[PDB]
Structure formats: C-alpha cells, structure tokens
From a paper:
Recently, two group A flavoprotein monooxygenases (FPMOs) ([name] and GrhO6) and a flavoprotein oxidase (GrhO1) were shown to mediate the drastic remodeling of the 3 backbone and subsequent spiroketal pharmacophore formation. First, [name] generates a ‐spiroketal moiety as part of the advanced intermediate dihydrolenticulone (4), which entails the rupture of three C−C bonds and a CO2 elimination step. The functional homolog RubL from rubromycin biosynthesis was shown to catalyze the same reaction sequence, pointing toward a universal strategy for spiroketal formation in the rubromycin family. In this work, the combined crystal structures of [name] and RubL suggest three interconvertible catalytically relevant conformers, hereafter referred to as the “acceptor state” (FADox in OUT; accepts substrate, no reaction with NADPH), “reducible state” (FADox in OUT with bound substrate; reducible by NADPH) and the “catalytic state” (FADred in IN with bound substrate; reacts with O2 for hydroxylation).
To investigate the spiroketal synthases, the crystallization of [name] and RubL was attempted under low‐salt conditions in the absence and presence of native substrate 3 and stable shunt product 7. While no RubL crystals formed under the tested conditions (however, crystals formed under high‐salt conditions, see below), yellow rod‐shaped crystals of native [name] (without 3/7) were obtained after ca. 4–6 months that diffracted up to a resolution of 1.75 Å (for summary of all refinement statistics see Table S1) and enabled structural elucidation by molecular replacement. The [name] structure obtained in the absence of substrate adopts the acceptor state (=resting state) similar to three closely related group A FPMOs from bacterial secondary metabolism (RdmE, anthracycline biosynthesis, RebC, rebeccamycin biosynthesis, PieE, piericidin A1 biosynthesis). Notably, the FAD‐OUT conformation in [name] seems to be stabilized by a tryptophan residue (W281) that is properly positioned at the re‐side to engage in aromatic π‐π interactions with the isoalloxazine ring. The [name]‐type I enzymes including RdmE, PieE and RebC typically function as aromatic hydroxylases and exclusively feature this W fingerprint motif. Presumably, the observed CT complex is caused by the aromatic sandwich π‐π stacking of the indole ring of W281 (W289 in RubL) with FADox. Taken together, this provides strong evidence that the “OUT”‐conformation of the FAD observed in the crystal structure also predominates in solution. Hence, in the acceptor state of the spiroketal synthase without substrate, the direct reduction of FAD‐OUT and uncoupling are impeded. Hence, instead of being thermodynamically controlled, this kinetic effect may be caused by the gatekeeping W281/W289 side chain that sterically blocks the re‐side of FAD in the OUT conformation of RubL to prevent short‐range hydride transfer by NADPH in the acceptor state (as similarly proposed for RebC).
Author numbering: 5 to 94, 101 to 537
Write the structure that this text describes.
C-alpha cells in the first residue's frame, strides 16, 4: 500500500510528501503532534526555494499568504511592546522569476499539507514512529496512533524528517560533526490582542529586554497571534521544564508590558541554535533530510531552505528507483549531492551568526557568501550527472549569475513566450527528465525518443529557438544557448529537480546523439 514512509509532519516531511505525491509515489507520513505547529519558526524562503515550490504549485498560494505580512517592515528593540522603543529601522529579475518569500512556517506548512493531500499523500497526525527495522526488501515501522494503538507500517523506504533529535538517525548509529549547540531557546506561542498595543505599528521582529524577560517577539499578520523566543542557561541549572504554563504567561506579559492585554498561551517548544551535520544522509533504505541531517544556525534562515532542497533532491530519485527506471544506487547520490551542501550551509550559518553578532574575524567576513550564492549557486561535487570533459570543475558554490548550465548546477532561467504568453525554462522542469536543444538542434527530438524508449523513462523535448511557431517556446531575446553553455546545435538534459544532468555543446550526427544521450541517462539513473 505505502511505498515511502515519512517520519515528521513539519516543513521537510511535508515538502517530501508533496514532491513524492507529485511524482505519483504512494506516501504515508506520520507526525506525532496532532497537526502542524502554530510557531512561526523559519520565516524567509529564498528565490531558489520558491522556484522548487513553483514546480508543485505551492509558490502562488505562499506568495498570497506572504502579502499579509509585507507591511511588517520595522525591526525594533524595546523594553516591552507597550513600553519604550530603544531602536527601530526598516535586482534579481535577470536570474530568477522568484523573490524572497517572507512567510512564517506555520502558514507555509498548511499550504504544503493541503497540496500533499490533493496529490493523494496519506498524512497521519497524532501518529508516533516508535521504532523500525529494515531488511533487504523494505522497512517495518512501528507506529503508535493517537488512541495509543500500535501497528507496523511496511514501506520500501523511510525518509527521516523527524528534526534535530531524530530517533531514526540515532537508531541508525549515524553520528554528527560540527561546532555543536551554541544556545538553548524556548518558543512560546500565544494569542493576544496585538492591535491594542501596536496601534499602527507593524514589526518584522522585536528584541525585548527588561528586568523580567529578554527574547525575540513576533506578531502575525492578523495581530492575533504571537511568539516569544527566550533563552535559558543550563549552567544555572535552568531547563525546558522551568517553562511551565504559569512561567510562559509571566514571560509573555512581561514582553507585552500591558497586563490589560489578555494572553492565551498555546504551546512552548524547545529550539537550539546549533551547527551539527550527519556523517551520512543514507543508510540502506533510510534517507535522512532536513534538521535530522543538518542543524544550521538560524542567521540567514538557511536551515529551512536547505531542508526543502533536500526533499526536492531525494523525491524524484525515490520515484525513479520505485518505478524500476533507476538503480537503487541513485539514492546514494542524495548523500553525495546534499551532505556537502548541508555541511557547507551549516558553516555559512555559523559565519552569518558571527557577522550578525559583531564577533566575526575579517576571515569569517571574507568566507561569508551571499544567500543567493549559498541557496542558488550550488555545483554538486559528484552525483546523478555527467561532468563536461576538459571543463574546470566548479567549487561547491559560485555567484549564480556566473553559472552557464554546468552539469550538477541549476539549469539557468531563460525567459520564453508560448503563443504570446510568458514562460521560462524553469516552467519546463519539475515533472520528469527534460531535453532542451538550440535552434539548430531539431534532430535531438529523435535522440530523446531513442533514449526514452531504450530506458523506459519519459524525456520531454523542447527545442528553444528565437522565432519558433505556434505552440512552441520562443527564445524572445536569443539568450538560451549562451545561458546553457552550448552552441545552437547542442542539447542539455535536465533532471526532474532542474539540475543539469548532461550536455552536448555541439550537434551529434545521425544516431550518435541518441547513443550519447542513452549512455549519459543510463549513468545518471545508475543503470
Ligand atoms: C520552536 C522552533 C523554532 C524555530 N525557529 C527557527 C528560526 O527562528 N529560524 C530558523 O532558521 N529555523 C528555526 N527553526 C527550525 C526550523 O523550523 C527547521 O529548520 C525546519 O522546520 C526544517 O526542519 P525539519 O522539518 O527537518 O524538522 P523539524 O521542523 O524539527 O520537524 C520534525 C518533526 O518530526 C516530528 N517527529 C519527531 N519524532 C517523531 C516521531 N518519532 N514520530 C513522528 N513524528 C516525529 C516532530 O514532532 C516535528 O513535527 C525552529 C524550530 C523550532 C522547533
């Protein structure tokens, strides 16, 4: 019944459910909590993340939800929201059609949950993974339901999206490396009448510091929901268990500073600022994604972005393995591609925290990359792609504006029109393998047909030409070939995650094209 089991119904588990169900993989997700967290948690989704979400129709509703928060421009430090304001303060179009999406996680997760359900994912909230075993043929997961009933779920694979203290990662005996836990926090979600203390003021984030509380205060778009994130110090013997119902009510009222405002405490969750990355992201039939694979310091919000990109990398790979169109070795490329990105991103998170806290060395400032380089400029060191002979390999990340279709990088964004309606290369990706060819590459259609039939895998062919007739994509400024680093007779094979798999810079005469594409796609698919 269930081919992939997902543990965790937070951002990465739900992203995995959407991407898997998009690729028509039967999915069961278990989440111990009775629904999605109301905590805002990570709030910034970079353009690359938005492009990923675009492929499953989540970017549009997420942008709609984000416009509600767009007036929240002011960052402030205050004694309390009602009291003294200490301080306050407030072009990618050639690279990406997406902008930074400023939407709290508690608003993105319902959109993902809704889309996974639409696509036919089975989501079980109030369901706890107790333990699992795996064998040559599959995974057997003990799940305890909301009624305390147990049952054993049999899946082909298990994706562990079960967060930083992942009992799955620990049960596999996967260790982690990195600088470790930097500070311990509690996120306190509450309802309150914010409008009565804000008046016309709208904040992105408020730093609260008075004698009774220090922490970070946020209010939602409706002005009815907030979150106070406070530190505790274990070397004073303080712990999560000190954050009682009464203690949470005291901290929030101290942060608001009014007492006429009625506060309803919803829930408290622990959260650590940490730099910890799993030594391996794949163990036989278990894949580890998101916070379970990498705890990333929050400065820059790279963690949430990195986890959605993990879900996107692994989901089509499971689909092809489960379809028998790929060898099981294709799953190991999830580890190959994503672990180095995870470890690099965790270190970039640590640099950003150092720079932000004004404790960075000049070397740390020199090492710190733009968020666009960190999230859109990746070149995987190796994995499910064929590198260009002779080509100087790329470093793990570059200025994404400098990328020109190198295998292991994001297939570049080129603006197209189809029947006068705007399109881009990115719209062609996300469903299946795609072969793009230049104006002089009409013969690559037959090569795509030959490769597709040989390997029993779909290949969508699009010649990209600056005239193109009815129903075909027009390259309206003739930039496709230069952007994809090929000649007008060349072709580029793009994976279902929009990463370049292979290219031919030049034409290939007769059946040579078909033979070369079949060989390349056979390597990519571990066959
Ligand atoms: C309170 C809080 C505040 C945060 N604030 C920030 C922030 O300000 N900035 C930032 O960048 N990131 C922040 N994060 C982290 C961010 O939310 C994560 O990076 C993001 O959600 C991706 O993590 P994930 O989905 O892989 O795992 P998580 O979000 O950790 O979710 C894991 C899920 O697995 C579930 N689970 C665990 N064990 C089991 C089990 N045995 N059976 C079933 N379900 C299980 C958990 O209940 C949970 O819903 C915060 C996280 C928390 C919890």
């Amino acid at each position: 019944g269930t081919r992939v089991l997902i543990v965790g119904g937070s951002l990465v588990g739900l992203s995995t459910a959407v991407f898997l169900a998009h690729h028509d993989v039967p999915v069961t997700l278990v989440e111990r909590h009775p629904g999605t967290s109301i905590h805002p948690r990570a709030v910034g989704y970079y353009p690359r993340t938005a492009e990923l979400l675009a492929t499953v129709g989540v970017e549009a509703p997420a942008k709609a939800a984000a416009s509600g928060f767009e007036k929240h421009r002011t960052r402030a430090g205050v004694e309390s929201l009602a009291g003294e304001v200490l301080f306050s303060k407030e072009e990618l179009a050639d690279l990406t059609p997406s902008s930074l999406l400023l939407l709290p996680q508690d608003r993105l997760e319902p959109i993902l949950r809704a889309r996974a359900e639409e696509l036919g994912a089975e989501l079980r909230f109030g369901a706890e993974l107790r333990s699992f075993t795996q064998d040559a043929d599959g995974v057997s997961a003990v799940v305890r339901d909301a009624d305390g009933g147990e049952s054993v779920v049999r899946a082909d694979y298990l994706v562990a999206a079960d967060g930083p203290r992942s009992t799955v990662r620990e049960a596999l005996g996967i260790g982690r490396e990195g600088r470790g836990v930097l500070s311990r926090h509690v996120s306190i979600a509450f309802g309150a009448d914010f409008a009565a203390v804000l008046g016309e003021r709208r904040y992105s984030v408020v730093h609260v510091q008075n004698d009774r509380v220090t922490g970070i205060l946020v209010h939602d778009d409706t002005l009815t929901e907030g979150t106070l994130i406070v530190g505790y110090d274990p070397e004073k013997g303080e712990g999560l268990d000190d954050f009682t119902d009464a203690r949470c009510a005291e901290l929030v009222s101290a942060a608001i500073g009014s007492d006429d405002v009625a506060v309803t405490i919803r829930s408290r969750f622990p959260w650590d600022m940490a730099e910890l990355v799993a030594d391996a992201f794949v163990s036989d039939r278990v894949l580890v994604a998101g916070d379970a694979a990498h705890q990333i310091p929050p400065t820059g919000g790279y963690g949430a972005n990195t986890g959605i990109a993990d879900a996107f990398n692994l989901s089509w790979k499971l689909a092809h393995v489960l379809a028998g169109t790929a060898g099981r070795a294709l799953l190991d490329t999830y580890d190959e591609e994503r672990r180095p990105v995870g470890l690099y991103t965790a270190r970039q998170g640590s640099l950003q925290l150092a720079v932000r806290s004004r404790t960075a060395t000049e070397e740390q400032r020199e090492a710190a990359h733009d968020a666009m380089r960190v999230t859109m400029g990746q070149a995987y060191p190796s994995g499910a792609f064929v590198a260009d002979a002779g080509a100087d390999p790329l470093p793990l990340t570059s200025d994404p504006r400098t990328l020109r279709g190198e295998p292991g990088t994001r297939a570049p964004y080129v603006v197209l029109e189809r029947d006068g309606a705007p399109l881009s290369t990115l719209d062609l990706f996300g469903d299946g393998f795609v072969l793009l060819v230049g104006a002089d590459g009409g013969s690559w259609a037959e090569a795509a047909g030959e490769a597709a039939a040989g390997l029993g895998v779909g290949i969508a062919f699009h010649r990209v030409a600056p005239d193109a007739g009815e129903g075909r994509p027009v390259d309206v400024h003739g930039r496709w070939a230069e952007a994809y680093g090929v000649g007008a007779a060349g072709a580029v094979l793009v994976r279902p995650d929009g990463i370049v798999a292979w290219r031919s810079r030049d034409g290939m005469p007769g059946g040579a094209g078909g033979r070369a594409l079949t060989a390349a796609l056979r390597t990519v698919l571990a066959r």
